[PDB]
Amino acid sequence: GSGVGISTGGWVGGSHFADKYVITKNTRQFITSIQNGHLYKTEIINPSNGNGKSQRCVTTPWTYFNFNQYSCHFSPQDWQRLTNEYKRFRPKAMLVKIYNLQIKQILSNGADTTYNNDLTAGVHIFCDGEHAYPNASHPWDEDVMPDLPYKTWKLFQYGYIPILNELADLDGTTAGGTATEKAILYQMPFFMLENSDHEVLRTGESSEFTFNFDCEWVNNERAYIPPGLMFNPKVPTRRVQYIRQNGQTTASTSRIEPYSKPTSWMTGPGFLGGQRVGPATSDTAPYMVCTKPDGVYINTGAAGYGSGFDPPSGSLAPTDLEYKLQWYQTPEDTGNNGNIIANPSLSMLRDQLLYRGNQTTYNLNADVWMFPNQIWDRYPITREHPIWCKKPRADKNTIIDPFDGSIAMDHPPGTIFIKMAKIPVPSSTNADSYLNIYCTGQVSCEIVWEVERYVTKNWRPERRHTALGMSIGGTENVSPTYHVDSAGTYIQPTTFDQCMPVKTNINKVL
Amino acid sequence: KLFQYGYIPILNELADLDGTTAGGTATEKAILYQMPFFMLENSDHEVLRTG
Amino acid sequence: GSGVGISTGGWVGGSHFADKYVITKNTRQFITSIQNGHLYKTEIINPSNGNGKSQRCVTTPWTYFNFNQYSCHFSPQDWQRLTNEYKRFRPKAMLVKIYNLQIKQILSNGADTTYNNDLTAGVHIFCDGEHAYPNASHPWDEDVMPDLPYKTWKLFQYGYIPILNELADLDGTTAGGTATEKAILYQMPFFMLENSDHEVLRTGESSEFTFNFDCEWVNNERAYIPPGLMFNPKVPTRRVQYIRQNGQTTASTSRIEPYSKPTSWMTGPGFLGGQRVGPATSDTAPYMVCTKPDGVYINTGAAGYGSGFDPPSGSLAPTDLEYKLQWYQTPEDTGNNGNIIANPSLSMLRDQLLYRGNQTTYNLNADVWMFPNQIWDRYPITREHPIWCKKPRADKNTIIDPFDGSIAMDHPPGTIFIKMAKIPVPSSTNADSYLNIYCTGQVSCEIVWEVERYVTKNWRPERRHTALGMSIGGTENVSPTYHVDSAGTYIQPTTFDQCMPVKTNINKVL
């Protein structure tokens, strides 16, 4: 039946591998609490050491489910088998369920806090599938579902940047701001999730959401040679090379050597030319993408009217550690420990470089723009990467290849928003008084993954991801990677190869 | 009274990384590098309330 | 149509992977020549340094196809993918074809030899599928089909041991041998392949042979724990251990500790007790299986009336290098180079040991016979192993588990025998004169392999075979394993793991 004593779902988990598809199933226990005391608020974060960088933030009384990472949908076993056995994969269909909800009242009698459920209390659930509201999720956020199925998932408050602050900040000689800055505030949108229709559930209820992906494949393959090596060294070429007079060397006309043939295929795009600009508390990137309408007043540097573009490097080989993708494996990691620095996948469509001859030597071209006949592989994503990102709605765009490796889509999976229904309290003073409550429940995500198995005429063995590439750590230093410790600590991958990137194992004939 | 479930993942003296060499021998480390880890949450199963 | 200018087949090659089956296809160019000058002969090999060991050998004017190894049916790529992606495999159906035959006449005019074809010449082909004749093939022979499809396959002369020599050798005080030895010669069988019906082909003809396997699986899985670790350490046991009085220690009765529970499962069988007996030119094994009827005269030692039993060790952990499986990778290998010594698969159903307490310490039991409740894994075969062996026809036998890892069958794939049809020459002197000819042709072997994909609830990554486990060698030392050299030399696997054994990658819950 249905009621308070009947569960609305069950635990779903594991994976199913087939030839043409993989089904991953993940359930988590999540917790949500009241945010902003049921208020919408617009705050200005303006760090003193932020070197003039600022944000406007509308914080909402809402929290949201973020499913975007690979590690949350794949065990390390399943990710290994995925990247070892398949040439490519993409998401096919997502199905998420929120069920087994429990709304407890929080009673503070003192230092001791007690918990008893309000059976008539309720919870708001809203999935935004048309992206009618500012997107909650962003790639590489820590809000994502946990990797370990038995770890609790704590939802993060939803907030959005209503405006670019330095454009709206009403600073300058004139009082009240310039005419252009005021015009940019006079229209600053304000979004409330309460403006949409959505669901209110009690403990005996549940909700489910389906999403259909239509996506480009994630290709797991490596180029064993660059596109320039695709010729045959033994056959001569008809091509002639003329070399102009250089100093005392006479100009010559000769047949190009058989072992260097000319290539038609350029280095992929990328920027090696920029450099990060401290301090670390500002936005530090080799490149700022800025918007600066005419008539605004800017008292800061490029950071703070613009966003840092990172990784700047494309398929180009990073010439410095600043250009490499890097992330901390846990939220408690700081400094040089817990960080994973990306290393080459040893694919020959990655780590490209472009040199121009000055007729003496070749010198590196740092900034490689889009140019015809460019051939490159997209970034070698690992088990920890964002799966997707939100593609901005715009008139025009170039080739969409986010350098972090996430897949940009017009409509990604919609964000499911959840908040505690407000339970007002009588107040003789007309104060705003609500009952303190929280919801815990079980959220499951089933994703169907369309996959393709490789076929190779290669005679020789190929690289595969092996547990022998794992490292040993822990409190007692006996615990291998992706295993729990004596304290229950989950041993994180130390290095980029332990994250099992794609575009490593399976060779590819160009 | 139900008892806690637990299992022996590996034979310890083979995995214990003891010896003259630091960090264990190459064979003992290979025996840890694959030590299985099982979670019952990886399976589908049932959640029941009182009714 | 059909004739001299029409080919009777084509080159077949490669592999096809599916979920439930794998199809391997291999074609080779083979060569055969006249053997024993078209005679049957019985030779006694009796090496002076053989330490009294001898054999009777009936050599035949026949050569034979030997398909038994894994490396001939699988590329290293295909073998890798087989052992990485599948928990078990067995042969299903074999199909072999001999076609595109060419019989050339060999003309020796001097130091120069010329070759022109006899179009009316023919070649005998006989497959023995009932094993009506002594089996040609034996495990670990070098007669097997080559690994590289472009290398020529030279067939080996067929011969068989008619009798055990020291029993038949008519040695002793009495002249002409004892009554028992003479009785063992008076019946010594003699086999001619000409006694069977078989096929004679000319260049425009071809023959094909099908074989259906019914076999036990080859299991690719590893035990991560021994069968003795299958308990739960945290729950107590009801079992009591009584320890008798030892010296000044009082006899005690106590509950067995929770972290050692008693096991029901014994060490598998094996012999660690024997030792090889030189010199290397005799039969050197830790154990001789001998036959010594009463009334025979034996002037030698155990070697020469018996056969060496090697590897003596079972699933037992080899305590010495003598007990380890070892082979040379090429026929030209000698000494300590080119040899591959088997190393542990790190499966816990292998490398077993048995100790008995003397009530002070535990001492190793060297010879472990069959005992109830024994649990072990069969040998971890590699890409170079015999696939099958011939099981002897006998009334009674114990569990069949050849320690080399080959699969013993009542009827293996039949041996295809081939010889050059004799082309007699007129002789006024009544000499035996034949025309000197040889046959080259193309032989293809298609095997269907029934396979099974693994399923695991293991969270953590598992070991896999990786090209990064390969080593680099060659004339210029730039050539990686399983690749050709500058001279065209094929770089052989140096170590046992490069041969990619089974029972390594895929974990198994006992």
Coordinates of all heavy atoms in Angstrom, one line a residue, chain C residues 387-447:
Chain C
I387 N 47.8 -27.1 -25.6 CA 46.4 -27.0 -25.3 C 45.9 -28.3 -24.7 O 45.2 -28.3 -23.7 CB 45.6 -26.6 -26.6 CG1 46.1 -25.3 -27.1 CG2 44.1 -26.5 -26.2 CD1 45.5 -25.0 -28.5
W388 N 46.2 -29.4 -25.4 CA 45.7 -30.7 -25.0 C 46.8 -31.7 -24.9 O 48.0 -31.5 -25.4 CB 44.6 -31.2 -25.9 CG 45.1 -31.3 -27.3 CD1 45.8 -32.4 -27.9 CD2 44.9 -30.4 -28.4 NE1 46.0 -32.1 -29.2 CE2 45.5 -30.9 -29.6 CE3 44.3 -29.2 -28.5 CZ2 45.5 -30.3 -30.8 CZ3 44.3 -28.5 -29.7 CH2 44.9 -29.0 -30.8
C389 N 46.6 -32.9 -24.3 CA 47.4 -34.1 -24.4 C 46.5 -35.3 -24.6 O 45.3 -35.2 -24.4 CB 48.3 -34.2 -23.2 SG 47.5 -34.3 -21.6
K390 N 47.2 -36.4 -25.0 CA 46.5 -37.6 -25.2 C 46.4 -38.4 -23.9 O 47.4 -38.6 -23.2 CB 47.2 -38.5 -26.3 CG 46.6 -39.8 -26.5 CD 45.2 -39.7 -27.0 CE 44.7 -41.0 -27.6 NZ 44.7 -42.1 -26.6
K391 N 45.2 -38.7 -23.5 CA 45.0 -39.5 -22.3 C 45.1 -41.0 -22.6 O 44.5 -41.4 -23.6 CB 43.6 -39.2 -21.7 CG 43.3 -39.9 -20.4 CD 41.9 -39.6 -20.0 CE 41.6 -40.4 -18.8 NZ 40.2 -40.2 -18.3
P392 N 45.9 -41.7 -21.8 CA 46.1 -43.1 -22.1 C 44.8 -43.9 -21.9 O 44.0 -43.7 -21.0 CB 47.1 -43.6 -21.1 CG 47.8 -42.3 -20.8 CD 46.8 -41.3 -20.8
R393 N 44.6 -44.9 -22.8 CA 43.4 -45.8 -22.7 C 43.7 -46.8 -21.5 O 44.7 -47.5 -21.6 CB 43.1 -46.5 -23.9 CG 42.6 -45.7 -25.1 CD 42.3 -46.6 -26.3 NE 41.8 -45.8 -27.4 CZ 42.6 -45.2 -28.3 NH1 43.9 -45.2 -28.2 NH2 42.0 -44.6 -29.3
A394 N 42.9 -46.8 -20.5 CA 43.2 -47.7 -19.4 C 41.9 -47.9 -18.6 O 40.9 -47.2 -18.8 CB 44.2 -47.0 -18.4
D395 N 42.0 -49.0 -17.8 CA 40.8 -49.4 -17.0 C 40.5 -48.3 -16.0 O 39.3 -47.8 -16.0 CB 41.0 -50.7 -16.4 CG 41.2 -51.8 -17.3 OD1 40.8 -51.6 -18.5 OD2 41.7 -52.9 -16.9
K396 N 41.4 -48.0 -15.2 CA 41.2 -47.1 -14.0 C 42.2 -45.9 -14.1 O 43.3 -46.0 -14.7 CB 41.5 -47.9 -12.7 CG 40.6 -49.1 -12.5 CD 39.1 -48.6 -12.4 CE 38.2 -49.8 -12.1 NZ 36.8 -49.4 -11.9
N397 N 41.7 -44.8 -13.5 CA 42.6 -43.6 -13.4 C 42.0 -42.8 -12.3 O 40.9 -42.9 -11.8 CB 42.6 -42.8 -14.7 CG 41.3 -42.3 -15.1 OD1 40.5 -41.8 -14.3 ND2 41.0 -42.4 -16.4
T398 N 42.9 -41.9 -11.7 CA 42.5 -41.0 -10.7 C 42.1 -39.7 -11.4 O 42.0 -39.6 -12.6 CB 43.6 -40.8 -9.7 OG1 44.8 -40.3 -10.4 CG2 43.9 -42.1 -9.0
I399 N 41.9 -38.6 -10.6 CA 41.6 -37.3 -11.2 C 42.6 -36.9 -12.2 O 43.8 -37.0 -11.9 CB 41.4 -36.3 -10.1 CG1 41.0 -34.9 -10.6 CG2 42.7 -36.2 -9.2 CD1 40.6 -34.0 -9.6
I400 N 42.2 -36.5 -13.4 CA 43.1 -36.1 -14.5 C 43.4 -34.7 -14.4 O 42.6 -33.8 -14.7 CB 42.5 -36.5 -15.8 CG1 42.2 -38.0 -15.9 CG2 43.5 -36.2 -16.9 CD1 43.4 -38.9 -15.6
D401 N 44.6 -34.3 -14.0 CA 45.1 -33.0 -13.9 C 46.6 -32.9 -14.2 O 47.4 -32.9 -13.3 CB 44.9 -32.4 -12.5 CG 45.3 -31.0 -12.3 OD1 44.6 -30.1 -12.9 OD2 46.2 -30.7 -11.5
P402 N 46.9 -32.9 -15.5 CA 48.3 -32.9 -15.9 C 48.9 -31.6 -15.3 O 48.4 -30.5 -15.4 CB 48.2 -32.8 -17.4 CG 47.0 -33.6 -17.7 CD 46.0 -33.2 -16.7
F403 N 50.1 -31.8 -14.7 CA 50.7 -30.7 -14.0 C 51.3 -29.6 -14.9 O 51.6 -28.5 -14.4 CB 51.8 -31.2 -13.0 CG 51.2 -32.0 -11.9 CD1 52.0 -32.8 -11.1 CD2 49.9 -32.0 -11.6 CE1 51.5 -33.5 -10.1 CE2 49.3 -32.7 -10.5 CZ 50.2 -33.5 -9.8
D404 N 51.6 -30.0 -16.1 CA 52.0 -28.9 -17.0 C 50.9 -28.0 -17.4 O 51.1 -26.8 -17.8 CB 52.6 -29.5 -18.3 CG 51.6 -30.4 -19.1 OD1 50.4 -30.4 -18.7 OD2 52.0 -31.0 -20.1
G405 N 49.6 -28.4 -17.2 CA 48.5 -27.6 -17.6 C 47.7 -28.0 -18.8 O 46.6 -27.5 -19.0
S406 N 48.3 -28.9 -19.6 CA 47.6 -29.4 -20.8 C 46.4 -30.2 -20.4 O 46.3 -30.9 -19.4 CB 48.5 -30.2 -21.7 OG 48.9 -31.4 -21.0
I407 N 45.4 -30.2 -21.3 CA 44.1 -30.9 -21.1 C 44.1 -32.3 -21.7 O 44.2 -32.4 -22.9 CB 42.9 -30.1 -21.7 CG1 42.8 -28.7 -21.0 CG2 41.7 -30.8 -21.6 CD1 41.9 -27.8 -21.7
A408 N 44.1 -33.3 -20.8 CA 44.1 -34.7 -21.3 C 42.7 -35.0 -21.8 O 41.7 -34.8 -21.1 CB 44.5 -35.6 -20.2
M409 N 42.6 -35.6 -23.0 CA 41.4 -36.1 -23.5 C 41.5 -37.5 -24.0 O 42.6 -37.9 -24.5 CB 40.9 -35.2 -24.7 CG 40.5 -33.8 -24.3 SD 39.9 -32.9 -25.7 CE 41.4 -32.5 -26.5
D410 N 40.4 -38.3 -24.0 CA 40.4 -39.6 -24.6 C 40.7 -39.5 -26.1 O 41.7 -40.1 -26.6 CB 39.1 -40.2 -24.4 CG 38.9 -40.7 -23.0 OD1 39.9 -40.8 -22.2 OD2 37.7 -40.9 -22.6
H411 N 40.0 -38.7 -26.8 CA 40.3 -38.4 -28.2 C 40.6 -36.9 -28.3 O 39.7 -36.1 -28.3 CB 39.2 -38.8 -29.1 CG 39.0 -40.3 -29.1 ND1 38.2 -40.9 -28.2 CD2 39.5 -41.2 -30.0 CE1 38.2 -42.2 -28.5 NE2 39.0 -42.4 -29.5
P412 N 41.9 -36.5 -28.5 CA 42.2 -35.1 -28.9 C 41.9 -34.9 -30.3 O 41.4 -35.8 -31.0 CB 43.7 -35.1 -28.6 CG 44.0 -36.1 -27.6 CD 43.1 -37.2 -28.0
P413 N 42.2 -33.7 -30.9 CA 42.2 -33.6 -32.3 C 43.1 -34.6 -33.0 O 44.2 -34.8 -32.6 CB 42.7 -32.1 -32.5 CG 42.3 -31.5 -31.3 CD 42.4 -32.4 -30.2
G414 N 42.5 -35.2 -34.0 CA 43.3 -36.3 -34.7 C 44.5 -35.7 -35.4 O 44.5 -34.5 -35.7
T415 N 45.6 -36.5 -35.5 CA 46.8 -36.0 -36.1 C 46.6 -36.2 -37.6 O 46.3 -37.3 -38.1 CB 48.0 -36.8 -35.6 OG1 48.1 -36.6 -34.2 CG2 49.2 -36.4 -36.3
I416 N 46.9 -35.2 -38.4 CA 46.9 -35.3 -39.8 C 48.3 -35.7 -40.3 O 49.3 -35.0 -40.0 CB 46.5 -33.9 -40.5 CG1 45.0 -33.6 -40.1 CG2 46.5 -34.0 -42.0 CD1 44.7 -32.2 -40.4
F417 N 48.4 -36.8 -41.0 CA 49.7 -37.3 -41.5 C 49.8 -37.0 -42.9 O 48.8 -37.0 -43.7 CB 49.8 -38.8 -41.2 CG 49.9 -39.1 -39.8 CD1 48.7 -39.6 -39.2 CD2 51.0 -39.0 -39.1 CE1 48.7 -39.9 -37.8 CE2 51.0 -39.4 -37.7 CZ 49.9 -39.8 -37.1
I418 N 51.0 -36.6 -43.4 CA 51.2 -36.3 -44.8 C 52.5 -36.8 -45.2 O 53.5 -36.7 -44.5 CB 51.1 -34.7 -45.0 CG1 51.2 -34.4 -46.5 CG2 52.1 -34.0 -44.2 CD1 50.8 -33.0 -46.8
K419 N 52.6 -37.4 -46.4 CA 53.9 -37.8 -46.9 C 53.8 -37.6 -48.4 O 52.8 -37.5 -49.0 CB 54.3 -39.2 -46.7 CG 53.4 -40.3 -47.4 CD 54.0 -41.6 -47.2 CE 53.2 -42.7 -47.9 NZ 53.7 -44.0 -47.6
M420 N 55.0 -37.5 -49.0 CA 55.1 -37.4 -50.5 C 54.8 -38.8 -51.1 O 55.4 -39.8 -50.6 CB 56.5 -37.0 -50.9 CG 56.9 -35.6 -50.4 SD 55.6 -34.5 -50.8 CE 55.7 -34.5 -52.6
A421 N 54.0 -38.9 -52.0 CA 53.8 -40.1 -52.8 C 55.1 -40.5 -53.4 O 55.8 -39.7 -54.0 CB 52.6 -39.9 -53.8
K422 N 55.4 -41.8 -53.3 CA 56.6 -42.3 -53.9 C 56.6 -42.3 -55.4 O 55.5 -42.7 -56.0 CB 57.0 -43.7 -53.4 CG 58.3 -44.1 -53.8 CD 58.7 -45.5 -53.3 CE 60.0 -45.9 -53.8 NZ 60.4 -47.3 -53.3
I423 N 57.6 -41.8 -56.1 CA 57.6 -41.8 -57.5 C 58.8 -42.7 -57.9 O 60.0 -42.2 -58.0 CB 57.8 -40.4 -58.1 CG1 56.5 -39.6 -57.8 CG2 57.9 -40.5 -59.6 CD1 56.6 -38.2 -58.1
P424 N 58.6 -44.0 -58.0 CA 59.7 -44.9 -58.3 C 60.4 -44.6 -59.6 O 59.8 -43.9 -60.5 CB 59.0 -46.3 -58.4 CG 57.9 -46.1 -57.6 CD 57.4 -44.7 -57.7
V425 N 61.6 -45.0 -59.7 CA 62.5 -44.8 -60.9 C 63.0 -46.1 -61.4 O 63.3 -47.0 -60.6 CB 63.6 -43.8 -60.5 CG1 64.7 -43.9 -61.6 CG2 63.1 -42.4 -60.4
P426 N 63.0 -46.3 -62.7 CA 63.5 -47.5 -63.3 C 65.0 -47.7 -62.9 O 65.8 -46.8 -63.0 CB 63.4 -47.4 -64.8 CG 62.3 -46.4 -64.9 CD 62.4 -45.4 -63.8
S427 N 65.3 -48.9 -62.5 CA 66.7 -49.3 -62.1 C 67.0 -50.7 -62.7 O 66.3 -51.6 -62.5 CB 66.8 -49.4 -60.6 OG 66.0 -50.4 -60.0
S428 N 68.1 -50.7 -63.5 CA 68.5 -52.0 -64.0 C 69.1 -52.9 -63.0 O 69.1 -54.1 -63.1 CB 69.5 -51.7 -65.2 OG 69.9 -53.0 -65.7
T429 N 69.6 -52.3 -61.9 CA 70.3 -53.0 -60.9 C 69.3 -53.4 -59.8 O 69.8 -54.0 -58.7 CB 71.4 -52.1 -60.2 OG1 70.8 -50.9 -59.7 CG2 72.4 -51.8 -61.3
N430 N 68.0 -53.2 -59.9 CA 67.0 -53.5 -58.9 C 67.3 -52.8 -57.6 O 66.8 -53.2 -56.5 CB 67.0 -55.0 -58.7 CG 65.7 -55.5 -57.9 OD1 64.7 -54.8 -58.0 ND2 65.9 -56.5 -57.1
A431 N 68.0 -51.6 -57.7 CA 68.1 -50.7 -56.6 C 66.7 -50.1 -56.3 O 65.8 -50.1 -57.2 CB 69.1 -49.7 -56.9
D432 N 66.6 -49.6 -55.1 CA 65.4 -48.8 -54.8 C 65.7 -47.4 -55.1 O 66.4 -46.7 -54.4 CB 65.0 -49.0 -53.3 CG 63.7 -48.4 -52.9 OD1 63.0 -47.8 -53.8 OD2 63.3 -48.4 -51.8
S433 N 65.0 -46.9 -56.1 CA 65.3 -45.5 -56.7 C 64.0 -44.8 -56.8 O 63.1 -45.3 -57.5 CB 66.0 -45.6 -58.0 OG 67.3 -46.2 -57.8
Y434 N 63.9 -43.6 -56.2 CA 62.7 -42.8 -56.3 C 63.0 -41.4 -56.7 O 64.2 -41.0 -56.7 CB 62.0 -42.8 -54.9 CG 62.9 -42.3 -53.8 CD1 62.9 -41.0 -53.5 CD2 63.6 -43.2 -53.0 CE1 63.8 -40.5 -52.5 CE2 64.4 -42.8 -52.0 CZ 64.5 -41.4 -51.7 OH 65.3 -41.0 -50.7
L435 N 62.0 -40.7 -57.2 CA 62.2 -39.4 -57.7 C 62.2 -38.4 -56.5 O 61.3 -38.5 -55.7 CB 61.2 -39.0 -58.7 CG 61.3 -37.7 -59.4 CD1 62.5 -37.8 -60.3 CD2 60.1 -37.5 -60.3
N436 N 63.1 -37.5 -56.5 CA 63.2 -36.6 -55.3 C 62.3 -35.4 -55.5 O 62.4 -34.6 -56.4 CB 64.7 -36.1 -55.2 CG 64.9 -35.4 -53.9 OD1 64.3 -35.8 -52.8 ND2 65.9 -34.5 -53.9
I437 N 61.3 -35.3 -54.6 CA 60.2 -34.4 -54.6 C 59.9 -33.8 -53.2 O 60.3 -34.4 -52.2 CB 58.9 -35.0 -55.3 CG1 58.5 -36.2 -54.4 CG2 59.2 -35.4 -56.7 CD1 57.2 -36.7 -54.8
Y438 N 59.2 -32.7 -53.2 CA 58.7 -32.2 -51.9 C 57.4 -31.5 -52.2 O 57.1 -31.1 -53.4 CB 59.7 -31.3 -51.3 CG 59.8 -29.9 -51.9 CD1 59.1 -28.8 -51.5 CD2 60.7 -29.7 -53.0 CE1 59.2 -27.6 -52.1 CE2 60.8 -28.5 -53.6 CZ 60.1 -27.5 -53.1 OH 60.2 -26.2 -53.7
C439 N 56.6 -31.3 -51.2 CA 55.4 -30.6 -51.3 C 55.4 -29.3 -50.4 O 55.8 -29.4 -49.2 CB 54.2 -31.4 -50.9 SG 52.5 -30.7 -51.1
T440 N 55.0 -28.2 -50.9 CA 54.7 -27.0 -50.1 C 53.2 -26.7 -50.4 O 52.7 -27.0 -51.4 CB 55.6 -25.8 -50.5 OG1 55.3 -24.8 -49.5 CG2 55.3 -25.3 -51.8
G441 N 52.5 -26.2 -49.3 CA 51.1 -25.9 -49.5 C 50.7 -25.0 -48.3 O 51.5 -24.7 -47.5
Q442 N 49.4 -24.7 -48.3 CA 48.9 -23.8 -47.3 C 47.9 -24.6 -46.5 O 47.0 -25.3 -47.0 CB 48.2 -22.6 -48.0 CG 49.1 -21.7 -48.7 CD 48.4 -20.6 -49.4 OE1 47.2 -20.6 -49.7 NE2 49.2 -19.6 -49.7
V443 N 48.1 -24.6 -45.1 CA 47.3 -25.2 -44.2 C 46.6 -24.1 -43.3 O 47.3 -23.2 -42.8 CB 48.1 -26.2 -43.3 CG1 49.2 -25.6 -42.6 CG2 47.1 -27.0 -42.4
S444 N 45.3 -24.2 -43.2 CA 44.6 -23.3 -42.3 C 43.9 -24.0 -41.2 O 43.5 -25.1 -41.4 CB 43.6 -22.5 -43.1 OG 42.5 -23.4 -43.6
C445 N 43.9 -23.4 -40.0 CA 43.2 -23.9 -38.9 C 42.3 -22.9 -38.3 O 42.7 -21.8 -37.9 CB 44.2 -24.4 -37.8 SG 43.5 -25.2 -36.4
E446 N 41.0 -23.1 -38.4 CA 39.9 -22.3 -37.8 C 39.5 -23.1 -36.5 O 39.0 -24.2 -36.6 CB 38.7 -22.0 -38.7 CG 39.0 -21.2 -39.9 CD 39.4 -22.1 -41.1 OE1 39.6 -23.3 -41.0 OE2 39.5 -21.5 -42.2
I447 N 39.6 -22.4 -35.4 CA 39.0 -23.0 -34.1 C 38.0 -22.0 -33.6 O 38.2 -20.8 -33.5 CB 40.1 -23.2 -33.1 CG1 41.1 -24.3 -33.6 CG2 39.5 -23.8 -31.8 CD1 42.3 -24.5 -32.7

